[model samples]
Target: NTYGWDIVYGCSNRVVNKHLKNYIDENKIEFLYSDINKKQEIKMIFDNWEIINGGTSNFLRIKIFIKEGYFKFRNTTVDLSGVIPILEIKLDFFNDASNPHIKELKFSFGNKVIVSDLSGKLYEEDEFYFNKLLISAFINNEKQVSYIFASLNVTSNIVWMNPKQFKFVYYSPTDNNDGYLCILSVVTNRDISKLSTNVDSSILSENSEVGLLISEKLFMENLLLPKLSSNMGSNITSNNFNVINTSDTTGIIKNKNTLNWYGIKVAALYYYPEINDFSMELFEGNKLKTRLSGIVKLTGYERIYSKLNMECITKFIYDNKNKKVSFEIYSTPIMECRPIFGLLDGIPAAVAKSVGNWSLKSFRDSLAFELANNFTDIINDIVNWNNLKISEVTNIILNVGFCIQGNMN
Candidate 1:
C-alpha cells in the first residue's frame, strides 16, 4: 500500500475548577502529550557532526570512547582542553544474520581513513561520507583513524643478480667465425682522477702490445704483403725528361758547361696498383727527384710496426748542387672511432632501435664529412705558411737583382 501520513493534533480534555461563587466554569484542552512528544522526537537538532558508513547493514560502528591518553595528535598550536576528544575508536560488524554476531577490529591511524571488509574490499559507496569526515577532522584539529579486519594472501617471485661488470675477448684473424665486440669499460670520475703517470703500468703496457698486434696484422694482411708481391719490379721509367737548375751566383761552376752541371734532373714514372687507370706524376725542380717523390707520397700514410713480416719503403732525394735533401714514407689509413661512454654510446643505439634507423651509407658519409671539415683547418695553415715564405724570397731576390743591374749599367 502506497501510503503517507501527516501530523494532526490529537484530542485531549482537561477539567477546570470553579472560581468565585455560584457557577462552575469548565476549560477544554486540545492535543495529547503522546502527540506532542512524537512531533518533538521527529525534529532533532544536529551540530558539529561526523558520519561514518562502512557498507550495507553489515558495517563497522566507530565509537570515540574517551579523550584521555588513548589517542595521539601531532603538530598543533591550539588547545583542545574542553573539546569532546575521541580515544580508541572501535569498529564492529555483524557476521551472521541469525545470531547477529559482531566482532571488534583493529584500527590504523592515518591522514585519510580507509576501512576494509572481511574479504579485503574497501567500501566507499558515497563520496559524501569521506568528505564529511575529512572536513570535520580538519575543522576540529582532530586526527581520525581507520579500522579494518581482513585476511591477506601475498605471493612473490625470486630474482637473480647479474653484475654490471664486462669481460673482454680478443678476436684473431685466423678465426673463421665472426666475433662480437662490445665495450664494457666505462669512464668515471675515478678513472679520470687517476693521473696518466699514476695509472697501472701493466694496463698501459698490455693495451700498447695488444693494439700494435692487431693493427700490424690487419695492415700487413690487407695492404703491405699483397702490394709487395704483386707490384714488385713493375716500376717503369718515363721516356720524357726535363733538366733545370738555378744560375750559379758564386761563379764556382761555369754556365752552360756540361762538366760543371749544377743539377741533373731525372723522372721515373710508375703505375699505382690500386689506381691502375691513372699514372703517378713525379716532379722535382732543383731537388733530387726520387727522394722528393717518395717523401710527398708517404706523408699522409699510416705505418705498422712488427717484428716478423714487416716491410717499409722510405724515399730520399739529395740535391748535390744545393746540399739539400728530402724524405718521404707511405703507410696505411689510420683507423679511429669515438670512445663509448655514458649518454653518447646510447645515442647511436637509440637512433637505430628506439628512433628511426638511418642507412649505413648515410651514417658513414656524415662521419666522413665531419672529418674532412675538421682537417681543412690544418691544410689552411700549411697554405698560409708556404705563401709567406714565397713572398719573402721573391722580394729579396728582386731587390738584389735591381741593385746589381744598376751597378752594371
Candidate 2:
C-alpha cells in the first residue's frame, strides 16, 4: 500500500437523536455503516452503526483496527527526514457519561498500511494502561528504524482532539556499508516508567557493541605496527642472524641511532574463557611461532607496549643467541630514573610529559634486573648450573664493563 489514514466511528446516544443529527450534519461526518429495517430499507439513525458506549465496546474496536492493519504494509517507507509518520488514530466516548471512561489505550503497526479495520474497545478509566502501538520501518539492507504513537479520550466528549505523535528513529549509519537502517515508532498511554525502561535497555546494547569495536582497533595497532617497522633490515649472515649496526664505535652507547641494530622480544600469556584454557609462550625462536590459543582477554595498550619492548629484545637475542651466554646490558637505575625525576619535578615540561614517565618506569624495571642478578648469584653458588655471571660474561665476550664496577679482575 502507498499510504492511508484510518477512519473510525465513535458514537454515543446521550446527546439525543436530534442533537446527534445536528452535530453530524455540522461536522460533515461520513458513516460507513447504517441501520436497516425489517424490510431491508436502511435507517438514517446513527444508532444503527457500531456504538461504543462501554469499556468493552471500545476495546473491541481497538482490536479490530489493529488486526486489519497487521498485514497491509509489506515494504513501506516513512520519510522521517521530513515530517514523521502517523500510524494509528482513535476516537472514544463522544456524547456520553464523563466517568468510567477510557483509562488505557495504544496503537501498534500490523502488516497493513491502514489501521482502522480492526475492532476493539476500551473504557475511559483504562486509558492509562493501554499498550503502546509499535511502528517500525526498514531502510538500507537492514531493519534499523522504529517509532511509537499513543493517545486517549474521555467520556461525554462530543469532540475529540488530535493526538500528539511520538516518533522514534532507531538506526543511523556511521559508515557506508551494506547493512540495514531501522526506524521504530511506538504510541502508548502508559506511565513514563515503561518508556524510560525501554529506552535505557536499547542504549546500553548499542553502546556496548560500539565500545568493543573501538577497543579491538586499538589492539590491532598495538600488536602489528612495531613488528612491521622492526623487520625492515634484518638478514642472515655466516650461519648466524645479523642486524646492521650504524653506531660509531667511539660514541657513547646511549648515542646509538640505528633502527637495524635494535631487536624485539615478545612473550604472551593469555587465557580463553570460552575454552577455559591458558597459554604462555615466547616469540623469539628460530621457528618464529605466531599462533596462540586460549586467549581470554587482551588490552590494546598492553599489546602495543609488549610488542615494542619485545621487538627491541628480539633484535638483541638475534645478534647474541649463538654465544654460550650473553649479557644484555641495560642503563643503570640512576640514569633511568632521570626521566621520572624530570617529570615529577616539573622540569622541561615537554620532555617530562612525553618520555619522562616511561623513563621512570624503566628505572623501576632496572630494580627487577638487580633482583635477577642477586638471584643468579645465589643460584650459581648453590647449584653451579653453568650460571654465567654478567660481569664475567660482558668482560670476556663483549669486552664491556659497567661504569660502576670499572675494570676490576
Candidate 3:
C-alpha cells in the first residue's frame, strides 16, 4: 500500500532493484531468479488468477510456491478444506571418507488387492518379484510383516529368499486360520542339487555360504507361493516330501506291484570367482511344474510302471563390494518304481537304478540345459531394466554406471 516500499534481492547489477524496473516500466514481474550461489527456485500461479482473483475466472485455481527449498503447490482447490498436493521433501548424499558412509540402499511400497471370486479355496491369482531377499523382518510384532513381501497374482519364477523346510526336520503348519493357505517352500535335498548343475560339485560342495537381489538381472528365482486346499491340498503333491534315493536303501517293498521310492536330502555351497556373464536359452512352454504324485499309468505293454521327478533349490548370496555372489544349492529327485510285470522285489531297485542312470547318461543332461536356458529367458524378461548407459551424465552421489572390470555390475 506504500509507494516507497522496495523489495530488492538477486543477481545482476543491484538485482531486485533491477528486478522491480520490469514491473514498474513494463507491468511485468519475474517470478523466479537465481544468484551466483546457484540456489535456484521457481513458482507459477495461474491467477496472480489473471490480475485479480474475484474478477473473472472462478472455475479453476492453482498456485505454486518455490522459495529456498520448499514447494507449496496445488492443481485445484476446495472450500474450507482441500486435498493437499505433494509434501516437499529433501534428500542428501550420504557422508563418507570421500564423504560419510553408505551400506545398502533401501526402498519400500505397498498395495491392496481385491478378491471377489468367492470360491472356498486358496488361489494365488497372481505373483510378483522383489529386487532384494525376503525374510522375517518383524517376526513377533507385526501381523503381516516379513523381511520381504509382494502382492502376487500367482508365483512368478523369480529369484526369491525361501523359508524352506525339509522333510521330518520340524513340525510343519500347512495352513493359516483361513484353512486354504499351504506353505509352498519345502526344499528337499534334491531341489538344491538340481539347481546347481552349472556349479561343479567338486568346487561348490566345499564352501559354506555367504546374500539379495543385486541390480535392477537381480534376475528371477523361484517363488514359493501358497495356494488353496482342495486342488493342491487333497493333491498333497505340492507340499509332500516323497522324493527318495533308492541308492541309499538295500531292499524294496514287499508287494510286487507297489514301488518303493527313492528320497532326496543334501546341500551344496560355493563361491563364484568373478562377475561371470552367464547366459541361457529356453522356451516358455518348457516348464517343470510340481507333480501331484507319481503316475501309476498303463503303458499297454503288460502294465508297466514309471515315475519321474526332480526339484532344485537355489540361494544366491551377493556381495556388493566383491562384485560377486556365493551360492548354496540343494538337489533332490523323486523317482524309482516297482511293478508286477518287471519281476520280483529286489529287482525293482536294480531296474529303476539302471533307468535313472540311463536318464542322466542319455537325456536328462540335455533337458537340464534347456530348463536352465528357459529360466534364463524368464530372468532376462524380469530384470531387463535396460537402464543401460547414457553418454551425458557425469557425476552424482549414487554409484550409477554400466560396466567395470570387464563385467556389468
Candidate 4:
C-alpha cells in the first residue's frame, strides 16, 4: 500500500499420512482386507493428532514481499501517474494465494476516487491466468487500460497476462467529472529540421477549456505526430471538411525566396485586427471555427525550400448533441511565403559549424509556419478517434520530447 514491500503471511502446517506415508511405504500393500483385519477400501493411518500435528516440519512457508515499484512513464506513460494501489506484489511461486484475497484496487486523484474492477488474491503453488483472475468490473478512469495489466504483471510469480489481447471493447459513462484526457502518441522517424533550437508552444484558451488552441513552432519538416485514442466516455468522427486554405492565392500565387548565399528561413503574418473589423464567432454547435497565423520553416536544408507567413483558419464541427466532430480548413485569409538566407555555402566548415547557433536563433521565430494539422490532412487519420462517447473533450496535447543517437565503432 505504502510504496514498498511487506509480509502477508504467517506460516501454516500441513501433512498427510495413509496415502502419503503409504506412498513412502508403498510396499505396505494391504494384505487382503479379510486377512489384515484392516479395511482395504480406506482407513486413516494418521490424523492431526495421529501425526500429533507433529509434522510441524511439514509447514507451507509463504511470504508476501513487494519491491519498490519503478515509476515507469512510457507507452501510455503520459497518462499514468500517481496510481495508489491497495497492495502490490512480486513472487517466485504461488499456492493457496486466494487464502488472502485482495480486498480492492483503487485509484485516487485530487479529491476523487476511481475504483478498478480488478480483484484477486495471491496463492502458493497455484497457477492463475491474469485474464481469468482479473474480474475487475470495468475501468472508469483517465489512465490507460494497458497499465492495469502492467500493474498486474507485478502482482505474482506466475501471473499470466497478454498485453496485446486486452481491449476497451465495452464502456459506459460515469457522473464523476467532465475532465477530459488525451493520449498524444508521437513518432518522428524522419524530419529535415535537425538544426532546430526549440519547439515553441502558444496555448491559449479562456483557460485549458473554452476555445482550447495550440500553436507549435516546428522549425522544419521537423515535427511528426503518431496515432491517438479517444476514450473516456467519448467517440469521434473527423475530417468532415478539410483542406489547406487554398483560396489563399486567388490566382494561385507560388512565391519563392532565394539568396545566392545560404540562410535561415522565416516569415511572420499579422491578423490585421487594426480595423477592429475582425469577425468572430467561436464554437457554434459541435463545430469550432479557428485560424493559425504564426512563423515556421517547413523548408529544411533538404526541402519546402521557402519561408512563409500564413493566415490559416480552421473549424472543428462536432455535434455537441451527437458527439460527432468534424474539421475544416475554412480559410487561409493570408499566406505569403518569403525567402531568407544563411551564411554562404562557401563558408569554411569550422566557421559554418561555429556560427550555427546564431543561425538557429536568428530565425527561430521568423521560421515559416505550416498548418501542422491541415484540414485536408486529419481526414485520413480521422484525428485518432477510438470510440467517441465523451460529453466534452480536452485540447489535443503535443509531445515533442524526442532523442536520437548514433554509435560508431
Q: Put down candidate 1 lDDT per residue, 1-409, tens digits, no spaces.
A: 0001000000000000011011111211111111232221111111121212221222222212111111122321222222231222222221333332212122333343433222101222232332223223321222122212311111101011011222212221232311111111111112322212111111112111110011111222222223322222233211111122132110011112111101111122211211111111122211111111110011112121101111222233333333222334432122122212245445333322211111211111211110111111211111111011111110000111100000000
Candidate 4: segments with Cα more than 4 A from true spot: 1-179, 189-215, 219-373, 379-382, 387-409
**Tens digits of per-residue lDDT for model 4 on 1-409?**
1001010001001111122233324332211111133211111121111111111111211211212111111221111112222211111111224433221111222231222222223321123232221212112221221111001112322121111111111011142112111111122122322322211122212222111111121101122111111110122111111122222111111112121112433232111110111111232322222222222233223321233233434444433343233445565455543334456643332232333323323322222222233221221121112111112333332221111111101
TM-score of 3: 0.21
Q: What is model 2's C-alpha RMSD?
A: 30.5
Compose the digit string of candidate 3's lDDT tens values, residues 227-296: 1111122323223321222221111111112222222111121111110111111112112222222323
Backbone clash count for every predicted candidate, in the order shown? 6, 78, 43, 38
lDDT values, one for every candidate: 0.18, 0.20, 0.20, 0.21
TM-score of each: 0.11, 0.15, 0.21, 0.17
RMSD of 1: 40.5
The lDDT leader among the candidates is 4
**C-alpha RMSD values across all candidates:** 40.5, 30.5, 26.3, 24.7
Residue by residue across 1-409, what tens digits does model 2's lDDT show? Answer: 0001111111112212233234334532221211133111111112112212221211222111121122111232111111112223232211213333432222222333233332223311222111122222211211111111111222212211111222221122233211111111112232322222111111112111110001111111222222332332243111221122222111111111222221221234321111111111122221111211111122222221111111112111212222222223333223221222322434333332333233223322321210112211221121111111222211111111110010101
In candidate 3 the C-alpha lDDT for residue 370 amounts to: 9
> Per the 3 Å backbone cut-off, how many clashing residue pairs does candidate 3 have?
43
Consecutive 10-residue window with the lowest summed lDDT within model 4: 2-11
